[PDB]
Amino acid sequence: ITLPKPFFFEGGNRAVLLLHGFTGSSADVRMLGRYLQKHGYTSLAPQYKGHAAPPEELTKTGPADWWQDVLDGYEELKAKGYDEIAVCGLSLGGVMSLRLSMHRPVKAVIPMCAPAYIKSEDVMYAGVTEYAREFKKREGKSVDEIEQEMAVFEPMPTLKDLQALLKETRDSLEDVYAPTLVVQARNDHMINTDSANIIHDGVSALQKELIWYENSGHVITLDKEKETLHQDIHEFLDGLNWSH
Template identity: 55%
Template sequence: MKVVQPKPFTFQGGDRAVLLLHGFTGHSGDVRMLGRFLEKNGYTCHAPIYAGHGVPIEELLHTGPEDWWDDVLKGYEHLKSLGHSKIAVCGLSLGGVFSLKLATEAEVVGAIPMCAPTIADHQDRLKAGMMARAKEIKQLEGKNEEQVAEELSALEKEPFTVLERSKKLIDGIGEQLDLVYAPTMIAQGRLDKMINTDSATMIYKNISSEEKHLQWYEKSGHAITFGPEKDQLHEDIYAFLQGLNWES
Protein backbone atom coordinates (compact mmCIF):
# COMPACT_ATOMS: atom_id res chain seq x y z
CA MET A 1 0.00 0.00 0.00
CA LYS A 2 1.26 3.47 -0.87
CA VAL A 3 0.89 6.04 1.89
CA VAL A 4 -0.15 9.43 0.52
CA GLN A 5 2.27 12.09 1.73
CA PRO A 6 0.51 15.03 3.42
CA LYS A 7 0.84 18.44 1.82
CA PRO A 8 0.81 22.04 3.03
CA PHE A 9 -2.47 23.86 2.50
CA THR A 10 -3.67 27.38 1.85
CA PHE A 11 -7.37 28.13 2.35
CA GLN A 12 -8.22 31.60 1.07
CA GLY A 13 -11.19 32.89 3.02
CA GLY A 14 -10.63 36.62 3.41
CA ASP A 15 -8.23 39.51 4.00
CA ARG A 16 -7.27 38.44 7.52
CA ALA A 17 -4.58 35.76 7.60
CA VAL A 18 -3.60 33.06 10.09
CA LEU A 19 -0.46 30.94 9.95
CA LEU A 20 -1.29 27.46 11.30
CA LEU A 21 1.57 25.33 12.64
CA HIS A 22 1.51 21.59 13.34
CA GLY A 23 3.18 19.55 16.06
CA PHE A 24 6.29 17.38 16.33
CA THR A 25 6.02 14.24 14.13
CA GLY A 26 2.72 15.66 12.84
CA HIS A 27 1.79 17.49 9.66
CA SER A 28 -0.74 19.95 8.28
CA GLY A 29 -3.58 17.55 9.12
CA ASP A 30 -3.11 18.57 12.76
CA VAL A 31 -4.70 21.94 11.98
CA ARG A 32 -6.79 21.22 8.88
CA MET A 33 -10.19 21.19 10.62
CA LEU A 34 -9.33 24.46 12.34
CA GLY A 35 -8.22 25.90 9.00
CA ARG A 36 -11.48 24.94 7.30
CA PHE A 37 -13.47 26.45 10.17
CA LEU A 38 -11.59 29.74 9.96
CA GLU A 39 -11.85 29.78 6.17
CA LYS A 40 -15.65 29.54 6.42
CA ASN A 41 -15.57 32.45 8.83
CA GLY A 42 -13.61 34.81 6.61
CA TYR A 43 -9.95 34.01 7.33
CA THR A 44 -7.19 32.94 4.97
CA CYS A 45 -5.12 30.14 6.51
CA HIS A 46 -1.80 28.63 5.50
CA ALA A 47 -0.22 25.55 7.08
CA PRO A 48 3.30 24.54 6.05
CA ILE A 49 4.87 21.15 6.76
CA TYR A 50 8.28 21.14 8.42
CA ALA A 51 11.21 19.25 6.92
CA GLY A 52 11.18 15.58 7.93
CA HIS A 53 7.50 15.62 8.87
CA GLY A 54 4.68 13.76 7.15
CA VAL A 55 7.28 11.20 6.04
CA PRO A 56 8.91 8.14 7.69
CA ILE A 57 10.46 8.89 11.08
CA GLU A 58 13.88 7.85 9.75
CA GLU A 59 13.85 11.04 7.64
CA LEU A 60 12.86 13.19 10.62
CA LEU A 61 16.05 12.12 12.45
CA HIS A 62 18.12 13.88 9.78
CA THR A 63 16.44 17.26 10.31
CA GLY A 64 16.27 19.63 13.25
CA PRO A 65 14.74 22.80 14.72
CA GLU A 66 16.70 25.07 12.39
CA ASP A 67 15.15 23.36 9.36
CA TRP A 68 11.66 23.47 10.86
CA TRP A 69 11.99 27.12 11.82
CA ASP A 70 13.01 27.93 8.27
CA ASP A 71 9.76 26.35 7.09
CA VAL A 72 7.78 28.44 9.59
CA LEU A 73 9.38 31.61 8.22
CA LYS A 74 8.66 30.51 4.66
CA GLY A 75 5.02 29.98 5.65
CA TYR A 76 4.87 33.48 7.14
CA GLU A 77 6.43 34.94 3.97
CA HIS A 78 3.98 32.96 1.83
CA LEU A 79 1.08 34.79 3.47
CA LYS A 80 2.94 38.07 2.98
CA SER A 81 3.36 37.23 -0.72
CA LEU A 82 -0.42 36.82 -1.00
CA GLY A 83 -0.81 40.43 0.13
CA HIS A 84 -1.51 39.92 3.83
CA SER A 85 0.23 42.57 5.91
CA LYS A 86 -1.41 41.52 9.17
CA ILE A 87 -0.94 37.90 10.23
CA ALA A 88 -1.88 35.96 13.37
CA VAL A 89 -0.13 32.71 14.27
CA CYS A 90 -1.63 29.61 15.87
CA GLY A 91 0.22 26.38 16.57
CA LEU A 92 -0.17 23.00 18.25
CA SER A 93 2.57 21.63 20.54
CA LEU A 94 5.87 22.31 18.72
CA GLY A 95 3.83 24.62 16.51
CA GLY A 96 2.81 26.48 19.65
CA VAL A 97 6.48 26.90 20.58
CA PHE A 98 7.12 28.30 17.11
CA SER A 99 4.09 30.59 17.49
CA LEU A 100 5.74 32.14 20.54
CA LYS A 101 9.11 32.33 18.77
CA LEU A 102 7.52 34.05 15.78
CA ALA A 103 5.91 36.57 18.10
CA THR A 104 9.38 37.49 19.39
CA GLU A 105 10.98 37.81 15.96
CA ALA A 106 8.32 39.03 13.55
CA GLU A 107 5.24 41.23 13.51
CA VAL A 108 2.11 39.26 14.34
CA VAL A 109 -1.36 40.52 15.20
CA GLY A 110 -1.82 37.79 17.80
CA ALA A 111 -0.47 34.42 18.92
CA ILE A 112 -2.31 31.24 19.90
CA PRO A 113 -0.06 28.53 21.39
CA MET A 114 -2.01 25.30 21.94
CA CYS A 115 -0.55 22.70 24.33
CA ALA A 116 2.86 24.29 23.83
CA PRO A 117 5.74 22.96 25.96
CA THR A 118 8.06 25.49 27.56
CA ILE A 119 9.32 22.98 30.14
CA ALA A 120 11.32 20.34 28.28
CA ASP A 121 10.92 17.31 30.54
CA HIS A 122 9.09 15.05 28.09
CA GLN A 123 11.89 13.69 25.90
CA ASP A 124 11.19 10.04 26.78
CA ARG A 125 7.53 10.49 25.87
CA LEU A 126 8.54 12.14 22.61
CA LYS A 127 10.76 9.20 21.66
CA ALA A 128 7.99 6.75 22.53
CA GLY A 129 5.64 8.80 20.36
CA MET A 130 8.12 8.74 17.49
CA MET A 131 8.44 4.96 17.70
CA ALA A 132 4.66 4.55 17.80
CA ARG A 133 4.29 6.83 14.78
CA ALA A 134 6.99 4.90 12.93
CA LYS A 135 5.18 1.62 13.59
CA GLU A 136 1.89 3.10 12.40
CA ILE A 137 3.42 4.31 9.13
CA LYS A 138 5.12 0.97 8.46
CA GLN A 139 1.87 -0.90 9.04
CA LEU A 140 0.02 1.46 6.71
CA GLU A 141 2.66 0.71 4.08
CA GLY A 142 1.56 -2.92 4.26
CA LYS A 143 4.77 -4.31 5.71
CA ASN A 144 4.48 -7.65 7.51
CA GLU A 145 4.94 -8.02 11.25
CA GLU A 146 8.49 -9.36 11.00
CA GLN A 147 9.64 -6.57 8.69
CA VAL A 148 8.06 -3.92 10.92
CA ALA A 149 9.81 -5.38 13.97
CA GLU A 150 13.19 -5.45 12.19
CA GLU A 151 12.90 -1.86 11.00
CA LEU A 152 11.76 -0.61 14.41
CA SER A 153 14.71 -2.40 16.02
CA ALA A 154 17.08 -0.66 13.63
CA LEU A 155 15.39 2.69 14.25
CA GLU A 156 15.69 2.26 18.01
CA LYS A 157 19.49 2.10 17.62
CA GLU A 158 19.66 5.40 15.74
CA PRO A 159 20.94 8.45 17.65
CA PHE A 160 17.89 10.55 18.50
CA THR A 161 19.93 13.76 18.70
CA VAL A 162 16.93 15.59 17.30
CA LEU A 163 15.31 15.31 20.73
CA GLU A 164 18.19 17.08 22.47
CA ARG A 165 18.12 19.81 19.84
CA SER A 166 14.38 20.17 20.36
CA LYS A 167 14.95 20.49 24.11
CA LYS A 168 17.35 23.38 23.50
CA LEU A 169 14.71 25.08 21.34
CA ILE A 170 12.04 24.70 24.02
CA ASP A 171 14.35 25.85 26.80
CA GLY A 172 15.36 28.84 24.71
CA ILE A 173 11.79 29.95 24.13
CA GLY A 174 11.02 29.46 27.81
CA GLU A 175 13.78 31.94 28.62
CA GLN A 176 12.49 34.54 26.14
CA LEU A 177 8.79 34.64 26.95
CA ASP A 178 9.12 38.23 28.18
CA LEU A 179 9.80 39.23 24.56
CA VAL A 180 6.25 38.28 23.56
CA TYR A 181 4.16 41.45 23.42
CA ALA A 182 1.42 40.43 20.97
CA PRO A 183 -2.06 39.60 22.27
CA THR A 184 -1.97 35.92 23.20
CA MET A 185 -4.53 33.17 23.76
CA ILE A 186 -3.03 30.12 25.49
CA ALA A 187 -5.05 26.93 24.99
CA GLN A 188 -4.22 23.89 27.12
CA GLY A 189 -5.87 20.49 27.49
CA ARG A 190 -6.25 19.57 31.14
CA LEU A 191 -5.75 15.85 30.33
CA ASP A 192 -2.54 16.39 28.35
CA LYS A 193 -0.17 13.50 29.17
CA MET A 194 2.54 14.43 26.66
CA ILE A 195 3.83 17.72 28.06
CA ASN A 196 4.11 19.33 31.48
CA THR A 197 0.89 21.36 31.66
CA ASP A 198 2.62 23.85 33.97
CA SER A 199 3.97 25.21 30.68
CA ALA A 200 0.64 26.93 30.07
CA THR A 201 0.79 28.81 33.36
CA MET A 202 4.46 29.61 32.73
CA ILE A 203 3.60 31.19 29.38
CA TYR A 204 0.75 33.19 30.88
CA LYS A 205 2.82 34.53 33.77
CA ASN A 206 5.95 35.40 31.79
CA ILE A 207 4.84 36.90 28.47
CA SER A 208 4.72 40.71 28.37
CA SER A 209 1.43 40.89 26.48
CA GLU A 210 -1.09 43.32 27.95
CA GLU A 211 -3.87 41.23 26.41
CA LYS A 212 -3.49 37.58 27.36
CA HIS A 213 -5.84 34.76 28.22
CA LEU A 214 -5.28 31.21 29.44
CA GLN A 215 -8.08 28.82 28.48
CA TRP A 216 -8.16 25.31 29.93
CA TYR A 217 -10.07 22.56 28.11
CA GLU A 218 -11.07 20.13 30.83
CA LYS A 219 -11.85 17.10 28.63
CA SER A 220 -8.99 17.45 26.15
CA GLY A 221 -5.57 15.86 25.93
CA HIS A 222 -2.50 16.89 23.95
CA ALA A 223 -4.03 16.55 20.49
CA ILE A 224 -6.50 19.26 21.35
CA THR A 225 -7.40 20.02 17.71
CA PHE A 226 -8.86 16.49 17.44
CA GLY A 227 -10.28 16.31 20.95
CA PRO A 228 -13.86 16.29 22.23
CA GLU A 229 -13.78 20.06 22.74
CA LYS A 230 -12.45 20.95 19.28
CA ASP A 231 -15.66 22.78 18.33
CA GLN A 232 -15.41 24.98 21.42
CA LEU A 233 -11.72 25.51 20.69
CA HIS A 234 -12.62 26.68 17.18
CA GLU A 235 -15.18 29.12 18.54
CA ASP A 236 -12.78 30.45 21.17
CA ILE A 237 -10.02 30.99 18.62
CA TYR A 238 -12.44 32.74 16.29
CA ALA A 239 -13.63 35.04 19.10
CA PHE A 240 -10.02 35.85 20.00
CA LEU A 241 -9.13 36.61 16.38
CA GLN A 242 -12.20 38.80 15.98
CA GLY A 243 -11.05 40.91 18.93
CA LEU A 244 -7.60 41.66 17.49
CA ASN A 245 -6.56 44.90 15.79
CA TRP A 246 -6.53 44.09 12.07
CA GLU A 247 -6.50 47.69 10.90
CA SER A 248 -3.43 48.89 9.03
Protein backbone atom coordinates in the same frame (compact mmCIF):
# COMPACT_ATOMS: atom_id res chain seq x y z
CA ILE B 1 0.19 5.51 2.44
CA THR B 2 -1.32 8.94 1.45
CA LEU B 3 0.86 11.70 2.95
CA PRO B 4 -0.61 15.12 4.03
CA LYS B 5 0.62 18.03 2.06
CA PRO B 6 0.77 21.87 3.17
CA PHE B 7 -2.43 23.91 2.55
CA PHE B 8 -3.40 27.49 1.75
CA PHE B 9 -7.09 28.31 2.28
CA GLU B 10 -8.31 31.70 0.85
CA GLY B 11 -10.73 33.76 2.94
CA GLY B 12 -10.55 37.52 3.57
CA ASN B 13 -7.71 40.02 4.12
CA ARG B 14 -7.11 38.69 7.73
CA ALA B 15 -4.53 35.80 7.74
CA VAL B 16 -3.59 33.05 10.25
CA LEU B 17 -0.38 30.97 9.94
CA LEU B 18 -1.20 27.48 11.35
CA LEU B 19 1.73 25.43 12.72
CA HIS B 20 1.61 21.70 13.42
CA GLY B 21 3.28 19.59 16.13
CA PHE B 22 6.44 17.44 16.24
CA THR B 23 5.72 14.14 14.23
CA GLY B 24 2.43 15.90 13.14
CA SER B 25 1.38 17.30 9.76
CA SER B 26 -1.00 19.85 8.26
CA ALA B 27 -3.76 17.27 9.21
CA ASP B 28 -3.43 18.52 12.82
CA VAL B 29 -4.73 22.02 11.84
CA ARG B 30 -6.78 21.31 8.61
CA MET B 31 -10.26 21.39 10.33
CA LEU B 32 -9.29 24.68 12.16
CA GLY B 33 -8.17 26.06 8.78
CA ARG B 34 -11.52 25.06 7.19
CA TYR B 35 -13.43 26.61 10.13
CA LEU B 36 -11.41 29.85 9.75
CA GLN B 37 -11.99 29.88 5.98
CA LYS B 38 -15.77 29.68 6.51
CA HIS B 39 -15.56 32.60 8.98
CA GLY B 40 -13.58 35.17 7.01
CA TYR B 41 -9.95 34.22 7.79
CA THR B 42 -7.28 33.19 5.25
CA SER B 43 -4.91 30.43 6.54
CA LEU B 44 -1.63 28.88 5.46
CA ALA B 45 -0.27 25.66 7.02
CA PRO B 46 3.35 24.83 6.13
CA GLN B 47 4.87 21.42 6.90
CA TYR B 48 8.21 20.83 8.66
CA LYS B 49 11.11 19.08 6.91
CA GLY B 50 11.10 15.30 7.59
CA HIS B 51 7.35 15.30 8.50
CA ALA B 52 4.57 13.72 6.33
CA ALA B 53 7.36 11.32 5.14
CA PRO B 54 8.83 7.98 6.23
CA PRO B 55 10.03 8.27 9.87
CA GLU B 56 13.68 7.54 8.89
CA GLU B 57 13.58 10.96 7.08
CA LEU B 58 12.39 12.67 10.29
CA THR B 59 15.49 11.57 12.30
CA LYS B 60 17.77 13.43 9.74
CA THR B 61 16.09 16.81 10.50
CA GLY B 62 16.05 19.17 13.49
CA PRO B 63 14.53 22.43 14.78
CA ALA B 64 16.90 24.56 12.55
CA ASP B 65 15.04 23.03 9.52
CA TRP B 66 11.56 23.28 11.12
CA TRP B 67 12.09 26.91 12.21
CA GLN B 68 13.08 27.82 8.58
CA ASP B 69 9.80 26.12 7.43
CA VAL B 70 7.83 28.40 9.83
CA LEU B 71 9.61 31.54 8.52
CA ASP B 72 9.06 30.30 4.91
CA GLY B 73 5.28 29.96 5.61
CA TYR B 74 5.12 33.46 7.23
CA GLU B 75 7.00 34.90 4.18
CA GLU B 76 4.69 33.04 1.71
CA LEU B 77 1.69 34.83 3.38
CA LYS B 78 3.40 38.22 3.09
CA ALA B 79 4.44 37.41 -0.55
CA LYS B 80 0.71 36.79 -1.33
CA GLY B 81 -0.05 40.28 0.06
CA TYR B 82 -1.27 39.45 3.61
CA ASP B 83 0.50 41.99 5.83
CA GLU B 84 -1.53 41.24 8.99
CA ILE B 85 -0.82 37.71 10.26
CA ALA B 86 -1.87 35.99 13.49
CA VAL B 87 -0.01 32.75 14.32
CA CYS B 88 -1.62 29.65 15.92
CA GLY B 89 0.11 26.28 16.56
CA LEU B 90 -0.32 22.86 18.19
CA SER B 91 2.32 21.50 20.66
CA LEU B 92 5.81 22.26 19.10
CA GLY B 93 3.79 24.48 16.71
CA GLY B 94 2.69 26.59 19.76
CA VAL B 95 6.38 27.01 20.71
CA MET B 96 7.21 28.01 17.12
CA SER B 97 4.24 30.49 17.29
CA LEU B 98 5.67 32.16 20.42
CA ARG B 99 9.20 32.21 18.86
CA LEU B 100 7.75 33.70 15.63
CA SER B 101 6.09 36.56 17.64
CA MET B 102 9.61 37.49 18.97
CA HIS B 103 11.13 37.59 15.45
CA ARG B 104 8.40 39.01 13.17
CA PRO B 105 5.37 41.28 13.60
CA VAL B 106 2.26 39.14 14.26
CA LYS B 107 -1.25 40.29 15.16
CA ALA B 108 -1.64 37.60 17.88
CA VAL B 109 -0.20 34.29 19.10
CA ILE B 110 -2.30 31.21 19.91
CA PRO B 111 -0.18 28.40 21.36
CA MET B 112 -2.30 25.23 21.80
CA CYS B 113 -0.85 22.59 24.24
CA ALA B 114 2.65 24.08 23.80
CA PRO B 115 5.41 22.48 25.91
CA ALA B 116 7.37 24.79 28.26
CA TYR B 117 9.12 22.05 30.32
CA ILE B 118 12.01 19.89 29.00
CA LYS B 119 11.52 16.06 28.81
CA SER B 120 14.53 13.63 28.83
CA GLU B 121 15.94 12.99 25.31
CA ASP B 122 15.06 9.23 25.64
CA VAL B 123 11.38 10.10 26.43
CA MET B 124 11.23 12.37 23.33
CA TYR B 125 12.88 9.65 21.19
CA ALA B 126 10.43 7.04 22.54
CA GLY B 127 7.69 9.31 21.09
CA VAL B 128 9.53 9.15 17.70
CA THR B 129 9.69 5.34 17.79
CA GLU B 130 5.97 5.10 18.70
CA TYR B 131 5.32 7.39 15.74
CA ALA B 132 7.50 5.24 13.40
CA ARG B 133 5.74 2.00 14.44
CA GLU B 134 2.28 3.50 13.92
CA PHE B 135 3.41 4.83 10.44
CA LYS B 136 4.73 1.39 9.46
CA LYS B 137 1.53 -0.27 10.77
CA ARG B 138 -0.50 2.14 8.54
CA GLU B 139 1.73 0.94 5.66
CA GLY B 140 0.23 -2.60 6.31
CA LYS B 141 3.68 -3.99 7.31
CA SER B 142 3.77 -7.30 9.25
CA VAL B 143 4.95 -7.34 12.87
CA ASP B 144 8.30 -8.94 11.64
CA GLU B 145 8.67 -6.28 8.87
CA ILE B 146 8.08 -3.53 11.50
CA GLU B 147 10.53 -5.12 14.02
CA GLN B 148 13.23 -5.53 11.31
CA GLU B 149 12.93 -1.83 10.31
CA MET B 150 12.83 -0.61 13.97
CA ALA B 151 15.96 -2.64 14.88
CA VAL B 152 18.04 -0.50 12.39
CA PHE B 153 16.17 2.78 13.18
CA GLU B 154 18.78 5.54 13.78
CA PRO B 155 19.13 7.87 16.74
CA MET B 156 17.99 11.48 16.42
CA PRO B 157 20.77 13.63 17.92
CA THR B 158 18.82 16.87 17.05
CA LEU B 159 16.37 16.09 19.93
CA LYS B 160 18.99 17.82 22.10
CA ASP B 161 18.51 20.92 19.85
CA LEU B 162 14.72 20.52 20.32
CA GLN B 163 15.34 20.55 24.16
CA ALA B 164 17.38 23.78 23.62
CA LEU B 165 14.54 25.37 21.59
CA LEU B 166 12.02 24.59 24.41
CA LYS B 167 14.39 26.02 27.08
CA GLU B 168 15.21 29.14 25.04
CA THR B 169 11.52 29.82 24.37
CA ARG B 170 10.58 29.36 28.04
CA ASP B 171 13.48 31.62 29.10
CA SER B 172 12.51 34.40 26.57
CA LEU B 173 8.68 34.58 27.14
CA GLU B 174 9.01 38.26 28.25
CA ASP B 175 9.84 38.97 24.53
CA VAL B 176 6.18 38.10 23.56
CA TYR B 177 4.21 41.43 23.38
CA ALA B 178 1.43 40.41 20.93
CA PRO B 179 -2.05 39.48 22.22
CA THR B 180 -1.85 35.89 23.43
CA LEU B 181 -4.52 33.19 23.75
CA VAL B 182 -3.08 30.17 25.63
CA VAL B 183 -5.10 27.00 24.84
CA GLN B 184 -4.51 23.90 27.02
CA ALA B 185 -6.21 20.46 27.12
CA ARG B 186 -6.76 19.28 30.76
CA ASN B 187 -6.29 15.54 29.97
CA ASP B 188 -2.90 15.96 28.25
CA HIS B 189 -0.61 12.93 28.76
CA MET B 190 2.06 14.25 26.38
CA ILE B 191 3.30 17.51 28.08
CA ASN B 192 3.47 19.05 31.59
CA THR B 193 0.15 21.05 31.51
CA ASP B 194 1.73 23.66 33.87
CA SER B 195 3.38 24.90 30.66
CA ALA B 196 0.04 26.78 30.01
CA ASN B 197 0.57 28.80 33.25
CA ILE B 198 4.33 29.27 32.50
CA ILE B 199 3.38 30.75 29.06
CA HIS B 200 0.35 32.78 30.26
CA ASP B 201 2.32 34.21 33.23
CA GLY B 202 5.62 34.73 31.31
CA VAL B 203 4.55 36.78 28.21
CA SER B 204 4.62 40.60 28.47
CA ALA B 205 1.32 40.89 26.46
CA LEU B 206 -1.33 43.00 28.34
CA GLN B 207 -4.04 41.27 26.23
CA LYS B 208 -3.87 37.61 27.21
CA GLU B 209 -6.16 34.75 28.28
CA LEU B 210 -5.76 31.07 29.29
CA ILE B 211 -8.57 28.62 28.36
CA TRP B 212 -8.61 25.06 29.78
CA TYR B 213 -10.45 22.36 27.75
CA GLU B 214 -11.78 20.01 30.40
CA ASN B 215 -12.65 16.97 28.16
CA SER B 216 -9.71 17.02 25.69
CA GLY B 217 -6.34 15.36 25.22
CA HIS B 218 -3.08 16.68 23.76
CA VAL B 219 -4.13 16.65 20.07
CA ILE B 220 -6.87 19.13 20.97
CA THR B 221 -7.79 20.07 17.32
CA LEU B 222 -8.91 16.42 16.63
CA ASP B 223 -10.78 15.84 19.98
CA LYS B 224 -14.41 16.24 21.06
CA GLU B 225 -14.12 19.91 22.19
CA LYS B 226 -12.67 21.07 18.81
CA GLU B 227 -15.95 22.92 18.02
CA THR B 228 -15.62 25.02 21.24
CA LEU B 229 -11.90 25.64 20.44
CA HIS B 230 -12.86 26.95 16.97
CA GLN B 231 -15.40 29.42 18.45
CA ASP B 232 -12.95 30.51 21.23
CA ILE B 233 -10.19 31.21 18.62
CA HIS B 234 -12.75 32.96 16.35
CA GLU B 235 -13.93 35.32 19.13
CA PHE B 236 -10.32 36.05 20.14
CA LEU B 237 -9.30 36.80 16.50
CA ASP B 238 -12.39 39.04 15.98
CA GLY B 239 -11.39 41.24 19.02
CA LEU B 240 -7.92 42.08 17.58
CA ASN B 241 -6.94 45.44 16.08
CA TRP B 242 -7.14 44.40 12.39
CA SER B 243 -6.92 47.23 9.84
CA HIS B 244 -10.28 46.02 8.42
